[PDB]
Structure formats: C-alpha cells, structure tokens
Design a binder for this molecule. Structure first.
Ligand SMILES: [Zn+2]
Lengths: 97, 142, 150, 129, 60
RNA sequence: AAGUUGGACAAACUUGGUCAUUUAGAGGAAGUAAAAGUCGUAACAAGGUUUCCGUAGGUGAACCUGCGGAAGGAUCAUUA
RNA sequence: GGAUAGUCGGGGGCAUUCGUAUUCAAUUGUCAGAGGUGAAAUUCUUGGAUUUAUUGAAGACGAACUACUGCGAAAGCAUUUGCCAAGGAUGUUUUCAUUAAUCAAGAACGAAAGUUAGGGGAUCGAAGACGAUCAGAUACCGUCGUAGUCUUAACCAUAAACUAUGCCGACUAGGGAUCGGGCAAUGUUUCUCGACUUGCUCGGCACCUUACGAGAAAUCAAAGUCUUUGGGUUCCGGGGGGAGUAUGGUCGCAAGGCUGAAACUUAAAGGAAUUGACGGAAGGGCACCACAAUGGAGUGGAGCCUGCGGCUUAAU
RNA sequence: AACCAGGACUUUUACCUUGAAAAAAUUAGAGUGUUCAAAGCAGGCAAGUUUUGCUC
RNA sequence: UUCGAUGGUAGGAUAGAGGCCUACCAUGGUUUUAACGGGUAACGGGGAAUUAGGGUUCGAUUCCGGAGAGGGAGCCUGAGAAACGGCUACCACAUCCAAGGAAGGCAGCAGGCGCGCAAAUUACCCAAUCCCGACACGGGGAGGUAGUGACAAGAAAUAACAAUGCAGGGUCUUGUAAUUGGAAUGAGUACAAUGUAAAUACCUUAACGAGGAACAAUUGGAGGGCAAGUCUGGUGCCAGCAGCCGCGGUAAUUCCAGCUCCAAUAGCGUAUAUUAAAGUUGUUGCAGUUAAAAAGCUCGUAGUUGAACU
C-alpha cells in the first residue's frame, strides 16, 4: 500500500541523489528524503545581553548570530519531535505551521 | 496486449501452446502421471495382496483410529494404503485376502484428516462388501 | 515520436494554402532556375540554397514558382550529387564521431550515440537501396566511411 | 504511428457523444470514413458533416444529434460471409432490430442488412447503434 | 503417518449395542402406486398448516 | 539331378561401443507429515538495533556487520 | 529523417584552476588530565596529553547556494576554465518523400558490492582486537584496525536497477505554480540590450480540486474511452509449499549469471478496507487503592486471637 | 482504318458470390399410421362386383 | 554428405518414371514459417461425446484406405502374393520319438490356460445377401438363425372398482382401512393355427389361471450445498463419520438400531477418463501498481502492423 504519493521523498525526473548524514545519529539518508530545519540562534542568552552590554566595548555593538542547518532522518526527527506522525487527512498538508 | 493482426495466428497459437503447460490439469493429462507415477495405470479398480493393518492417527482437530490396511498391488507389487468403509470389520478383513481396491473421489488426493490414503476396499476375498456387515453373505473358505 | 529520443516535439513549417507566387514576385520561373544552378555549381546543399532564396532573394517556396523541387531541378540539369543529402549528412556525422572515438577511448556515451547513428544510416541506406535511388550494391563500410562521406 | 484512421474517428465520435457535445472534429479524413459516415447518416444516427479541404488528408466536422449508444471499429477486418452475418449480429448488435454492422463488400461499403440483400459478403468494418 | 494404534479397541461400540426386534408391517404398494398415493394426499389431507411449515417428518 | 566357382538379397551368432527404460547399491546431502523437550525475537508495535533488496565476510540456529539502494516508514510538511 | 538560426542543459570525454575540512610531520606557550558514554570502561598523558600559532605533505570530497528545479536510454550526473564530439525543445513559405511502431534471436551501456594485476592508500570501515551490558553477549556502544572505499587497464551483469505502473498513435475537466523556446506590450526599470511584470502558444518535471469514467478498495488524467468487451506490437502468470531447489545446457579464472522441473504435501496462502485488542508509539487529561510530602500511622521485628496450605488421625 | 457484332481479356491476387466435380453410412430434415416410439424405406386404392390392375 | 546425401552424364534393373543401383563429374539439399532428434500410455479418416456462438475430448469398434499373421529374410506357381489355413533358412517357444527321424503357428469360427477391474455356445443352417467353381443342382464358422449375460436404446405391468365410524370439506367428496364381497384380470401351465431351412421369439389362440406370503420393487439421503427428523433406545472428542465446511468431552437432528419422509425407479450407488462449470488457457474472452506476473535501459533482424489521395 503506497502510503504517500511522493513515496516518502520529493524526487521527480531523477534517478539518484547524493546522500547526506544525520545529526543525532549520523545515518545515511538521501538528500531529499531528509528533514531540513533551520536553527538561527544568538551568541548570548536572552538574559545575557545585559551582562554583555555592561562588559563590552565598541559602543554597544550588535551581537552576532549563528545560522546552522540540521538534517534529520525519519527516526531521529520523530524521536526529537521536530517531525511527528499525523492523521491520514492531515498528512497532505505540506504548509509549515 | 495480445496481437490483433490478420496474420498473427502463429503468434497466438505459439503463446497459447507454451502457456497451456501452466495449468495443472493440462500438465497432468499430458505428462502421463496417471500411469507412471500413479499406483494404478489409469485403472478404475485393481486387485492387491494385504500386508498389514494400520491405525493411522487423525490430524487436527480430530484424533481417531481409522483401522486402515496396508496392501500390496498384485500387478506391480508396490505398497499402498486402503480404507475400510464399514465399522468394526477389522477382524473380518485379514491379511493376504486378495482384496479389491478402487479410488476415493479426489483423483489421487488424501481424504479428510488421514494423510496417505487414496484407495478403498470394494470387494474382499471375492465376497464383496455390504454383505459381511449385514450378515447377508458370509466369507468363503480359503 | 522521436526516432531515437524520448521527445515529442512537433515543430515544423506550415505551407500556405495558396500554390502561386506573390503578386510582386515576378520571378519569371527561369531566373530562379539559373540562380539555383549557380548556387549548385559551387556545391552548396539543396536545403541550404533553398534557405538562401527564401531569405536573401525573397523567393517563396521554389515549387510554387518553378514547378519543380530543388532536388528535381538540379537532377534534371545534371548537377546531381552522388549521394542523397540526408545520407551524406549522416555519414559525415558518423565519420566525425568515429574520429572522435578513436582519439577519446573512454567515451561510452559517444559510442552509444555512434551506434544510434549507425542504425539510422543503415536504415536510410536500406530504404534508398529499395527505392532504387542508389546502385543495388551499396554496402555501408565502417573503415571506408571516410570514402563514403568524401 | 496511426494504424487506422477509422478507429480514431469512431473513438472521437463516441467520446464526444458520451461527453454530450453536439459537434465533433475528426482528423484526418478518408473515403472509408466518409462512406461510414454516409451509412450512419442515411440510417439517421448522424446529422450533417462538412469536410474541410486543406492541402492535406483533410478534416471533418460532424454535427452529433445524440441517439448513439456506441460506435466502434472491428479490427482486424475479418472476412465475413453471408452465414457469418447472423453470428456477428448476435455478438455485437444489442438485438436483431437495433444496431447496424458495416461491411465493405464487393459492391461497396454498406450496412449488413443491405449487404445481405445484395447477396454478397465482404470484410467487417465496424458497428454503430 | 504415525506409528501408533490399538487394534483391540476397533469395533468397540458394535459389540456392545443391544439388538432390538422389529414390528411386522402390512404391505405398502410402491412405485407408481406410491407416487399416486402421495399425490392424492399432498394438498388436501394436511394437519401441519397454520404457519406453512409442512413438516412431512413430524417430531415430538 | 546332386555338387562347384563367382554376384546380390541377406535371417541369425559371436566382440565392443552408444541410446531409452528398469532393477541394484552401502553411504552422503534436502525438504515435506511429524513423540515431549529444545528455543527470542530474526520478523508481526518505534517487535523493543525502523524494515526490506543486491553484494561480501563472520556466526549452532534464525542471523550480525561493511557498501550502495527502496519505503512496501515511524516523515508527503520549515518559504523565516 | 536531414539541414539551418538563436539558444538551453549539475548530458559525455580529455586537460586544467580553486576550496576548506580530516590525518600526519617539524618547531614553539603551557601544564592535568585528555577521549568516550545515558553511566562507563579501554587507550594515552608532568617524558609535555588536550588546546592554540607557523609551514609542509597525503589522498578523499565539492557543504552553504540545493529547489515536489535541470540533463542523460538507464545506471547516474553539482568547484573554475579551455578543447572535442553530441542531444532535446523552439523558430522556419528549409530539403527527401513513407524512408514508420514493436520487438524472438542477436549486441552496446549497466549503481554498489565482488575479481585480476599496477599505482595510490587521509577519513570511514567487512574480518578482527579489547572494556561495561544482561543470567548468558558472542550483536548493538567506545577506541584501534584488515580486505574494501580512490585511479589505470581487463572481468561480471544484479538491486526495493521503483513511477512496484512496457512502447507507439488518437480523444477525454478546472485552476495555479515551474524549466526551455517563440510571439505581442506607444507596461516598469538598465550604465540596446538585459532584469521585472502581464497575455498567447509548443515541448517537459510536477501540484491542488472533481470524478463524467474506472477499480475489490486503497486510489487513478491514467490504472479513463472494457459485458456498450477489437488502433498496432513485444515480455510475462495460472492456489501456496516443495523451489528459483536438484539435474541438464550455457557465460565467467571465481563468487556467481542465464535457462530451469518432477515426485510429495497442504484447504488454503494473498490483496484492500472496517471494528475491537495490543504497542518498551505520540498527543489531551483523570486518580493517596499513584507519586511527590520534612510526610502521619503502621504491618513485616518479639509474643498472642482468627483464617489459609503442609502434618497427623478415623473424623480432625 | 474505326464503325457495328462475335471468340479470349485477372499482369497477379487475397477477399466475396455462384457453379462444376466429389462414397455411403452419420446429422439436420421431406414424405409415409413399425397399433405410439426407438424403427424401417416402405407404401396407397377398395368396402356394394373382392376386382387377370393402377398410382406415388 | 562413408557404404548416396543434392544435381548432371552414361549404363544396368524394374511392367514402367525415378540416385532404385552402378561408374564418373560438381557440393550440393532441409532448417526459428522449427529442419534433425525424442516421447507417443499414436493405425488414419467418415464419425462420436459436451452443446448459445467459439471451442474441448475421443475414434480399439458394423464403412473406406494401410500393415500383419511369433520375429525378420528368400523364393516357386500364378495376370495379380514377398501369400504364411504355399514353401525354404535362422532365432524364441512347444511337440511324437525304436533316440534314425518327422516336424507347427486360432491377431479366422466356437472352445482352453494365464495376465487380468473388465468381455458369451467346443449350438443350428446355406432359407435370405453375396462370393467362388467346369457350374440352373456344389461349397462358403462370409453371412443368417438361435443360446448366456444386469445396462446400449425404445413402449408400459405392480392394479382399480364400493360399502366404512370419523378429520373434514361442504346433502357433494379424498384418506389409513388388523374387514369383506362382488368386478376388469396378465404373466405363467398347457394341445391348436401363424411364424421359421427346421426351431426360439412375435401376433392371433384349446382351455386353467390372484384376496394377502397375494404373484412383498429397491438404491442413496434427511445440518448446509442438495429434498427430507430438537421423533425414541445404545456408546460418548472414543468407537466413528466425514467428497467440503463440519458433528462426536450424557439432552448426538451428522455415530448404530426402530419409525416416517425425500430424489430415482427395474433401477439406484461407487471408482476412474473426458466435457460443461473454466471469462481458472481468454481469437471471440483473462490478468500484470499493491492478490501470480512489465525484462535495468537502449539498438535492431526474421514476425506482426502499417497516414491520405487515382
Ligand atoms: Zn538520525
């Protein structure tokens, strides 16, 4: 029974896709079949901005930030709750929440 | 799908002939299993020489002693099994009684819960069945 | 569908319903014939010259005026090439691929393309042999394909 | 490659009739198609049809008036004798009074009843009802 | 296919069922007479009506 | 006429080989019908190391692992 | 089918440019732990471990941009540049004129792994080596590490080699995105063309709705135009095991590949979907026969009433 | 010459129609009262002379 | 393809054509449209069975053609035989034997042994059909006639005429009748006439010729498929049924005994082979995403299919 029309991943007009590695476990996962998530974080805590401003120079200069991308396999994404099992009708909703 | 040309008779006939062997009925009928591998040679009835008696156990969900007999065919000497229809006649059917065997109905398949039985006794010692159970005709002297 | 491809392109040319030269195009049906003969004397392709009369000279489809095809006109006038245009072009392409293959020994894609061209050239040669446009003994040669193209 | 233009014409006609459209366009055109259309038009299943004559095989625009359940082709065109007409009618036609089988006999393309009157068999082209 | 069997227990019941006697009965015509007889009593002489059961083998 | 020299037809017999069938043959490796026992998930749930395919090694047992694939997955989804 | 013009493409081959990452080597600043795991353990480290700074070498690989986007017959293809051969679509009043579709046989290519050798071998890593782990671990886990992963020249020939869906041709409903091409804009913008937007069309990758229609249903713009059954053409199956097993033939140096049964046995295997049940699955909650609480009282610890099994007797 | 008529006219077919030629038994089926029937190919007149025969 | 396989020349042999054979000369002939080899539990056909159509199976067998007389081989006579109810030689059988020898063939008609699941009289006749011959007359186990069988087919006998309390129904009408009398009696027993070569049988036909043992009609089933039992006694997941499901551990409608009914009827049942079912062999007319099955992809030959127009 074909659960998903995509068969679990988006791939059309192609025969092979270069695989990548997971993060929590580092499993072999296809590039499209993986789960891509964005975690844009700051270099300090929300409560550490005041301490940094008191103990910084350069006239309260803008604190930088870190952009990193995470690739999760199916099992790790489900376990880490970044991706969860949905109902049959709700599976088709590809729009992010 | 299948060719639909006015001159595709050879292709249709060849495909039908090649695929006809898939059917079990055609394969049996054309391989001569009723004569070579079968205990008989296509005969409806045959005669045999009794060897012994076996109380074959019944498979699930039953458990019974069916007082079957092990027989040796007269024409070939091979050993097969036979079933006694009437009840309690085991003492009546002895060994080396020149028994008469026939099929059972499935054309070479086991009947019910007893594996390895395909033949049943029609006549024994020339007196036949259905008479020694009602005491209509008694067995002859041997 | 494409002969040796998965494409289904339908690009072509739609000839007009009219079969007559334009009003101003007083091509007089003989100056064009002389122009075609001059364009064939150098040895240009019949398709290429027909393009030149369509673009530079401004001549309509040459049949509508001259009454005969480009190939037919030059054949009647005697300037008939030894081999058909499509036959010669395919042999040229096959020769070029084989010359590339003998240098680059690790081009399996080019070898496959060469095999397709060899299939195409043989089928076209078989048709031309059947139609009688060529001598009956026209066995295509792999070693002398350079001879056949030139 | 197009193997039989008659099959394409009849498939287009039956498809348009199922869709309910009152007009249908058939490309290309041939004498067999014209003869088949004439037979069904004479029998009353087909309204006027006009043959657009370009410098090609041609095109046909047919006015559909309903009252057609199914029109189809019989491929390959089996040779049909006089005694085979009854078998073909039983196999294809809904009954002995409804439906027409078109045969290309020696005297031309016509219905099975007319061919039977002509006392000449031929090859089966198709059917319509 | 199992090496197991008690040859003595065969025909156990047949040797212990008591044998009863049979009551003599007058002759009943058979064949066409029986077919005619059942036809004569097939729709008229009925006591199993009221329900439509038509039990030709009554039980009590 | 019997007999005799040559020619062919040549039945049949010895010696060997080949073909089809059958009968042997201890013993070795298979599964099916299977006395209690034996046995943990290898698979059925995230079957408790997600599953499966090809390939190679290793392991009393299903099997474990390396490489590449598929979801028939437990994800059709991160546009910020 | 062949030209011809602008193109387009992570299509192919050869040469060539760049990138940091990993590991290693020298030297320098320093000393207590460093690694690793849920917790460990092994190993190395006051001899200079880990970290940090400079230089150099090795091979592998092209992150981010990387997309329900592109190319290739498929397998597959992602750093720059140059060369060579080629390909589809588009435009075309370009050329030939049926030159076409399908394939038994027959041949080219054919992931990864496997083989023969040479070169090369950083990381990972079959086999293997150790230490927790449960009762046993022998496997998962951590470090090291063999063949292997790279390239050259020869092999084979299979995978869930998938779109579980052969190829060609015609018809069949609504929408919006998307790649390539072309047509039109007294539309915007740019130091003669390009970028953006809009409309039309052809050729692709797809998506949402609907079901006239199909199916056993899941679902399907094909799996529709099929009891109203016929456009053309290859491959393949006839209940499950036995068994892709034995034997036979054939290709390969080999592992193995192709072809490929019978006897015997079974009344069922199998697909879709529904309802309960279960999950060391998730999400909402509810509970001193659940926990948190510094909990309070206790039983169990000593001895007795009463009842239950063992013992005795004849009945206990 | 051709103008009229007559003999041959398929280049070569497949296809369709029809005809010739070709066992009987069999099958379908026509006719006929083995008392019906399976049958068989026989049969029928004529009810007042019992007809030196006729008819399928 | 030698020791003839393809063709040519010449010759021999045959009744005659011919590589049928011989000498020479060239290497030819068949074949994926299946040559060659193998199996056939294969004599072929008219035909038979099933029956929408299409199809599938069978044909040893009343007719036609072919081969054979245990197995081959050779030959005389004769127009015609490689004859076997003609002969010769060998092999395998069996045979009288003074041990020197002769010698024989029922797959012809009856009959016997054996293999067998399986198949009949060591009967009568040339009267009908035709055949042979020197022939109006002879012969014909060809053929006809009869005898025994369980079966291949077609027709019907086991009866019906009344009184009978009641269930009734409606003074009209069926029922079992522990009952009787008169009616219609047909098979058989037996001399006649036909029949027949003579007989058997058949039609007519001297006469005798049923009251309950009359002159007793049975085979399977009664849970479903598929029709008919929660009726009674015995065993009790045992005995056993049971084509399949399924029943049987004391209330057994399915086990064995009584009763009743059901389908068929001188027939019923069982086994095997085949057909319809099977649209599960699909040309008509199957199916290939997930149930069995689209080859990893591409080229492309036989093969199939092939745009429109005269
Ligand atoms: Zn992971």
């Amino acid at each position: 029974t074909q659960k998903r029309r995509n068969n679990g991943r988006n791939k059309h007009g192609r025969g092979h896709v270069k695989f990548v590695r997971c993060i929590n476990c580092s499993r072999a996962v296809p590039k499209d079949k993986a789960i891509k998530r964005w975690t844009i974080r700051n270099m300090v805590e929300t409560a550490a901005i005041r301490d940094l401003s008191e103990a910084s120079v350069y006239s309260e200069y803008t604190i930088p930030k870190l952009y990193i991308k995470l690739q999760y396999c199916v099992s790790c994404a489900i376990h880490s709750r970044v991706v969860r099992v949905r109902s049959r009708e709700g599976r088709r909703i590809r729009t992010p929440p | 799908g299948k060719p639909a040309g006015l001159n595709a008779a050879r292709k249709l006939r060849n495909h039908r002939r090649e695929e006809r062997w898939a059917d079990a009925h055609y394969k049996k009928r054309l391989l001569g299993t009723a004569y070579k591998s079968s205990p008989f040679g296509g005969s409806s009835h045959a005669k045999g020489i009794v060897v012994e008696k076996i109380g074959v156990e019944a498979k699930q969900p039953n458990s019974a002693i069916r007082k079957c007999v092990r027989v040796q065919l007269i024409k070939n000497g091979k050993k097969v099994t036979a079933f006694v229809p009437h009840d309690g006649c085991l003492n009546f059917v002895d060994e080396n009684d020149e028994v008469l065997l026939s099929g059972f109905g499935r054309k070479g398949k086991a009947k019910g819960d007893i594996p390895g039985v395909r033949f049943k006794v029609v006549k024994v010692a020339g007196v036949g069945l259905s008479a020694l159970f009602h005491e209509k005709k008694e067995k002859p002297r041997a | 569908g494409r002969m040796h491809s998965k494409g289904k392109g339908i690009a072509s040319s739609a000839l007009p319903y009219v079969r007559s030269p334009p009003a101003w195009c007083k091509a007089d049906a003989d100056s064009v014939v002389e122009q075609i003969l001059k364009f064939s004397k150098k040895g240009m392709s019949p398709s290429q010259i027909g393009v030149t009369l369509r673009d530079s000279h401004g001549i309509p489809q040459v049949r509508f005026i001259t009454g005969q095809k480009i190939m037919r006109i030059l054949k009647a006038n005697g300037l008939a090439p030894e081999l058909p245009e499509d036959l010669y072009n395919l042999i040229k392409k096959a020769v070029s691929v084989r010359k590339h293959l003998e240098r680059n020994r690790k081009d399996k894609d080019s070898k496959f393309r060469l095999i397709l061209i060899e299939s195409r050239i043989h089928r076209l040669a078989r048709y031309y042999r059947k139609v009688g446009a060529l001598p009956p003994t026209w066995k295509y040669e792999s070693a002398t394909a350079s001879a056949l193209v030139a | 490659v197009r193997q039989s233009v008659l099959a394409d014409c009849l498939n287009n006609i039956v498809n348009a009739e199922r869709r309910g459209r009152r007009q249908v366009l058939i490309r290309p055109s041939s004498k067999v198609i014209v003869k088949f259309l004439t037979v069904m038009q004479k029998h009353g299943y087909i309204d006027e049809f006009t043959e657009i004559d370009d410098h090609r095989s041609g095109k046909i625009v047919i006015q559909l008036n309903g009252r057609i359940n199914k029109c189809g082709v019989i491929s390959p065109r089996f040779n049909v004798k006089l005694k085979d007409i009854e078998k073909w009618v039983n196999q294809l036609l809904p009954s002995r009074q409804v439906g027409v089988i078109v045969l290309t006999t020696s005297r031309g393309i016509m219905s099975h009843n007319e061919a039977r009157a002509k006392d000449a068999g031929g090859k089966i082209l198709g059917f319509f009802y | 296919g199992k090496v197991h069997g008690s040859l003595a227990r065969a025909g156990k019941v047949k040797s212990q069922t008591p044998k009863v006697e049979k009551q003599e009965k007058p002759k009943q015509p058979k064949g066409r007479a029986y077919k005619r007889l059942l036809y004569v009593r097939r729709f008229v002489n009925v006591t199993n009506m009221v329900g439509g059961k038509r039990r030709m083998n009554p039980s009590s």
